[PDB]
């Protein structure tokens, strides 16, 4: 049954004032038993580009068919500004909307568990699923066809610019053995899309592959800002020097690295960094490694190399964020050749 609507794409001038937003709801329908709203807030105290509206107790709203819903939707769609979406909310998706707001607030808090070297070759990705996803919903998966009881509160999801649940979903595993087993059977799988009317929805092919990693350390933020083209390599043999051991053996292979770094931690595997001058040299290196991997019979899915990147950060007392900067000119370093 009907339980409320869901607004999106709202202008910043209406979310920052509760008086204006409340006035628009009184004329269309019930005023702010009266209805209630809930505005999503970020960790820094900033609002979002969407809101939520909840209807009164079901006692006075159970008998509401499509005839009364079409008129209400239509009438409440005109009062707000243009370029706005006003969709209905079912009984199942209503509970999921609350979790969406909580994920945005805990985005930075949740990106610390298993991110360090402790859990390196564990993390996985699968950007198949659409916005329709949940911790509970997704828990049933990877159990009926792969046999793998993954943790519950270890599920992280990214977000787009409009605080919308990005299709990029990331999972974790308790152990390391089962990691490989996840990315071998989840290929071209069609469990379901949506559970409406007691029947399944459209089809969706699954595709799991290791293409992204996470790391959190105190000696990684500064070193990874000086060079423009920085590489990452791992899965090395017993403990080694930089100038005396890493440089000498590098001559055999084709790394062609200007500089190098180390990665302590006291584990049984090392990981030395690499540096390049031009983007073409970096690019060519990627191919080389890839080719070599096959030769060695290491594994397609086996993490061997990667590209280092700096995650976007949002500071305080700033009128505009770095990620939302339209005047940035950080693309000239990547020349195009064809």
């Amino acid at each position: 049954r009907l339980e409320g609507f869901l607004l999106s794409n709202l202008p910043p001038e209406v979310t920052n004032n509760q008086q204006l937003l409340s006035s628009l709801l009184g004329r269309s329908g019930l005023p702010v038993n009266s209805a209630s709203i809930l505005l999503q807030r970020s960790r820094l105290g900033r609002t979002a580009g969407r809101c939520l509206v909840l209807l009164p107790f079901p006692s006075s709203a159970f008998l509401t068919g499509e005839d009364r819903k079409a008129l209400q939707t239509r009438l409440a769609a005109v009062l707000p500004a243009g370029s706005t979406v006003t969709a209905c909310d079912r009984n199942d998706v209503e509970n999921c909307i609350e979790e969406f707001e909580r994920y945005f607030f805990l985005t930075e808090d949740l990106q610390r568990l298993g991110v360090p070297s402790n859990l390196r070759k564990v993390v996985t990705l699968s950007p198949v699923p659409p916005t329709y996803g949940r911790r509970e919903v997704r828990d049933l998966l990877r159990e009926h066809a792969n046999v793998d009881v993954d943790p519950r509160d270890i599920v992280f999801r990214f977000r787009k610019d409009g605080v919308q649940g990005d299709t990029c979903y990331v999972l974790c595993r308790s152990e390391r053995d089962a990691g490989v087993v996840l990315a071998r059977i989840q290929e071209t799988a069609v469990p379901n899309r949506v559970h409406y009317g007691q029947l399944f929805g459209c089809s969706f092919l699954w595709a799991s592959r290791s293409a992204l990693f996470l790391c959190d350390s105190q000696l990684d933020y500064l070193p990874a800002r000086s060079p423009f083209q920085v590489f990452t390599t791992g899965w090395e043999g017993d403990v080694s020097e930089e100038e005396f051991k890493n440089l000498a053996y590098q001559l055999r292979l084709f790394p062609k690295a200007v500089r190098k770094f180390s990665h302590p931690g006291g584990e049984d595997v090392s990981s030395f960094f690499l540096e390049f001058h031009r983007m073409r040299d970096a690019k060519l290196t990627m191919s080389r490694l890839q080719l070599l991997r096959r030769r060695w019979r290491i594994g397609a899915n086996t993490p061997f190399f990667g590209f280092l990147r700096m995650a976007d950060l949002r500071f305080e007392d700033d009128v505009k964020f770095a990620d939302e900067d339209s005047a940035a000119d950080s693309d000239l370093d990547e020349p195009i050749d064809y």
């Binding site: 950007p127 299709t167 290929e187 071209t188 089809s203 092919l205 595709a207 293409a211 195009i336 064809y338």
Partner: protein
Amino acid sequence: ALPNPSVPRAALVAARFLRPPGRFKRAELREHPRSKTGAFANLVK
């Protein structure tokens, strides 16, 4: 499904300025044995 197969979105946006192959390059793919065929890359299945 039929029009467009399962193609990850990550590999579609990046492949933008990729020049299409020529006439002779096309025959290489079509030539037997088709060793350039990847996983789930079959044009018949």
